[PDB]
Amino acid sequence: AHCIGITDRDFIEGVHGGTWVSATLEQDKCVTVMAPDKPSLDISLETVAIDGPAEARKVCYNAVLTHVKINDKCPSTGEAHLAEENEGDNACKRTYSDRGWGNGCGLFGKGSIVACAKFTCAKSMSLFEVDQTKIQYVIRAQLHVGAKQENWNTDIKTLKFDALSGSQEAEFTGYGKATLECQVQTAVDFGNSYIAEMEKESWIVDRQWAQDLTLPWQSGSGGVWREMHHLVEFEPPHAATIRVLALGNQEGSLKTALTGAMRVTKDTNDNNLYKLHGGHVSCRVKLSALTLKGTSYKICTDKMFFVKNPTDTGHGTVVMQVKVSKGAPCRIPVIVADDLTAAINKGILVTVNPIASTNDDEVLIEVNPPFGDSYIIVGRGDSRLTYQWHK
Amino acid sequence: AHCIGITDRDFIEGVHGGTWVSATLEQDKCVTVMAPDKPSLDISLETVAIDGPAEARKVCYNAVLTHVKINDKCPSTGEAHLAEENEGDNACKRTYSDRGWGNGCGLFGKGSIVACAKFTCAKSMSLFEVDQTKIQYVIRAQLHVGAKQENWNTDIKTLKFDALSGSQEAEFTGYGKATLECQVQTAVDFGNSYIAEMEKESWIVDRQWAQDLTLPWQSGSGGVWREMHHLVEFEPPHAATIRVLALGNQEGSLKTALTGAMRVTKDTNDNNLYKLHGGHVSCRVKLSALTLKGTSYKICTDKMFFVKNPTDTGHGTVVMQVKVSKGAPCRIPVIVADDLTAAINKGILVTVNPIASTNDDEVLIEVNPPFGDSYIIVGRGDSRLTYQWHK
Amino acid sequence: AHCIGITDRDFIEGVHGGTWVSATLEQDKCVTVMAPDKPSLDISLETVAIDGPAEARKVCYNAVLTHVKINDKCPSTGEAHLAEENEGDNACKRTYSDRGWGNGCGLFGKGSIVACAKFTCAKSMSLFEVDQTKIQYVIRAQLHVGAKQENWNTDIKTLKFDALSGSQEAEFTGYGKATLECQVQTAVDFGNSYIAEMEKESWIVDRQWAQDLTLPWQSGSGGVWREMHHLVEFEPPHAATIRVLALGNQEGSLKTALTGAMRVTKDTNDNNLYKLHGGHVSCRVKLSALTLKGTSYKICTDKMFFVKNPTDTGHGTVVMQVKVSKGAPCRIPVIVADDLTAAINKGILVTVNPIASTNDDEVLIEVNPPFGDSYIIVGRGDSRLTYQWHK
């Protein structure tokens, strides 16, 4: 029961006549649903993932400049020009300067000057356009059949949800089945966002914010960088030669600005899905079709032993592993009570009807004790297993 | 001489100690200088000019759009681009079209679309640098030697000026010489300006106005038209479809906007030279080296004949033309008075000492009469020419 | 002289005789000094510099982590040491982690984790301490030498001006001599402050702000980096694992903080020199040992010609250039007046007594006309090279 493994867990109880019970699932949390005569069920959101985005824009975050060129003319010998102004891959600026005879000039006054440089991206952030139909929600489920730890990763059923897969049927061998309906149409707001990627790291960000970055960018299809001056400073002109400098690598500033956004991992092993951190989804469980497998079986009227002692969990419930011997397929009785007279059970089980199907079975049990001192009890007759507990 | 012809005229009268006399010459006007025992001098500003100024800019005012191309992308497939977008002689615009199944995209929404057009200029205005140092100007001058209107064009003295040689000298044959110190063409409007040329006409305009024209322009050295979006227009998008047009030829709007400027002319017959209008020049004339040619000669004594009657100039002088046919080179006496009987002269002889230069000769004479009724007289004796006149 | 060739200039007036004159030399400006008989004087800084200062620190701005490993212990079993945790070359963090049967561990609770990584600096600032004792200065001086601007580069008085070397004398010919005392040990405010170097660019800033940089740093050449956790992120532990990453290149963020600092240039050739910007000096200058030259040579009357007509410096004063062809040694006169009568000079002749030496060259002349209407006048015969001026 993998919710036992999860640090943050919520129990949910169905009304005796209810049919659907609903819960919110979010990645680091887990939920256990319980109903009065049916095996309890763990549910959790494993990942929200998205397949095959397409690039909208590349944004350059460190420019490098080459082949600087300059031209200048004297204060009344007409406007300066440079052939580089014609070329889209040249960043460029025009301005006046003071000029005087010592420059190789002919007059005193406001000369006219141009400089350009070949602009090239070294590294760039990629903004991906987000496919609002290819989102997938991945839910894990399992029943409290009471299987030992090492079996859990094989006994979970993995349900993948999307707008087509609007309801899913979870089948549990010999325990019947559950049906599950999660609200994918309204779980998240991706339509206003991009997946922003930097090398081996990524975020999901608002389209408006990204388009308002003060930073030079290019179409995903390729083209020409088209706000180049945002990364070039022209040092105001010394009258013989202006000079131009790259504004330096922005990486750390940029990813400082992203700190508010939700983290995303590109999974290089799982095809090329982008996996969101910290998404959530709302969902209904339908419980009618589950049944308590072993209800038929006789009580286990014979010796037992703990494979692991009853042990605390942060959830405020004890967990134990019990094994039988000389036993048929049979029902393990369990109670929690004030003293070994055991007149009134006060504990409420999570593993609703503990069973062994074969004498070599190794059975996990989880139970919520009342507050205060109490004795946990397993089995019946003078062979009772018993264990003291406090709160 | 030609101050007779020029409609707007000033008289300058030198006090005896004024070896120099100041004058202001204004481009349409004429000045007559008079001094007590010295021949009077007409003087006149003929031209103000710039030789071969440099082109600052060309401004396009009629554009046409040879090629057009469009690229478009569906609402979740990223930004469009074009190869032309990289190439400097293409105007371009970025927008989103609406898109949907009716136009081949898989999703309803707004799709990126970009269009570009190859721009070219049909006609452009040229702007030129006004070097305040290079302003040439030309002065006309004549003594009142009293020659026929037919002879002024031969007898005219022309004085050229530059920022160099502000002193200039006019000799007059048998009359001596005078010298002009001309201060610069005072040019009070011509700083911070361009000469604007547009086909067969031109204007001088301030730099700020010109640079603030909402029109595409390039350097005089040639290059790339820097603000093409003033003259291309893009219709709002339709699916996968932009219509682009030039704005109409702007010539008329530009001519009308320029109407307040001082107009400029090109001396197209002679030179690559631009001739201004509305100049002012201040000069001073040294008079002392002028002399009167015939003061030694005998008084002309035989009968004379009017080639032209006395007539009003409209300047309030009267002008006359007189023929002699007897007697060697001699002084022709002229006076104007009230009495027909022997009378003291009242008027000022603008032509101060009229003379015959040959036995059969024709002479022009100009006089400022007194106010009121009078008789004007030429010749000494019995057969005086005499003429009725008033104010 | 060359203080003409600079946008900002100032004019200081001394007094007759022995007096020292106060001056200032902020590194961009060039300043003019004059006195009622001594010629005018032009001075500027070349540079303020340090040679081979001492490293205070290196500060890393881009770390990379090359080995990572981890140790983890079940909750009751007590804290994890890890062998490299004492190795100064490794960054480390120690934190508890949640553990339980989903993690191969005996009891549910807070396990312990330690994780460490081998830190390496990839790129870093170098910081150099400076002491006023090591400040070099270099200064330019000129008066009215009459050298070609083509040769100022070799005429120019090149005062190397290290505070641990003797005061220096203006070694001019024919103008007497001058000397300078210039607060050389004490003009600056660079205390408690030091040079920061990036790749091929550099800045000067206070040691306090540098100490307050939240970045890992190293004192000596080699030795342990002091605060590596400022560039290592440890993602919160999960199960038996932690993931650690470099915080990414800070270069751009760091440079963004430096924009208000005064700039520095490490030299291109004497590669251990650092040339400071924004320095300044204040001086007193010994004018009284200077002389005019040719003070009683004849007032010239030769026929005389401009080579450059009166040009506004922008300093509120005029420059011009004049040539002559026979008065080769003679005193070229100039004055300024209300009228060409020139009864009195009314302006300040910033070259007070110009010196001719060749027929080949133009002489280089400056003048300051009074506010309002006036005539500038070169020569004083009828060879009046005269020009109207205004405020």
Author numbering:
A (entry chain B), B (entry chain C), C (entry chain A): 1 to 391
Paper quotes:
Yellow fever virus (YFV) is a re-emerging flavivirus that causes severe hepatic disease and mortality in humans. Crystallographic studies have resolved the structure of the YFV E protein and shown that its domain architecture is similar to related flaviviruses, with three N-terminal ectodomains, known as domains I (DI), II (DII) and III (DIII) and a stem anchor region known as the transmembrane domain (TM). Here we use a chimeric virus platform to resolve the first high resolution cryo-EM structures of YFV. Stark differences in particle morphology and homogeneity are observed between vaccine and virulent strains of YFV, and these are found to have significant implications on antibody recognition and neutralisation.
Given that DIII of 17D was critical in improving the particle homogeneity of bYFVES504, we next examined whether swapping DIII between bYFV17D and bYFVAsibi would have a similar effect. Remarkably, the bYFV17D/DIIIAsibi particles most closely resembled the phenotype of the virulent bYFVs, whilst the bYFVAsibi/DIII17D particles most closely resembled the phenotype of bYFV17D. We then resolved the 3D structure of bYFVAsibi/DIII17D to a resolution of 5.5 Å. The symmetry expansion method was also used to further refine the ASU of bYFVAsibi/DIII17D to 3.6 Å. Similar to previous ASU maps, the bYFVAsibi/DIII17D ASU map shows lower local resolution at the icosahedral three-fold axis, as well as no clear TM domains for M or E. This cryo-EM map was then used to build an atomic model of the bYFVAsibi/DIII17D ASU, which was found to be highly similar to the bYFVES504/DIII17D ASU model with a Cα RMSD of 0.85 Å. Furthermore, incorporation of YFV17D DIII into bYFVAsibi also switched virion homogeneity and FLE mAb neutralisation sensitivity phenotypes.
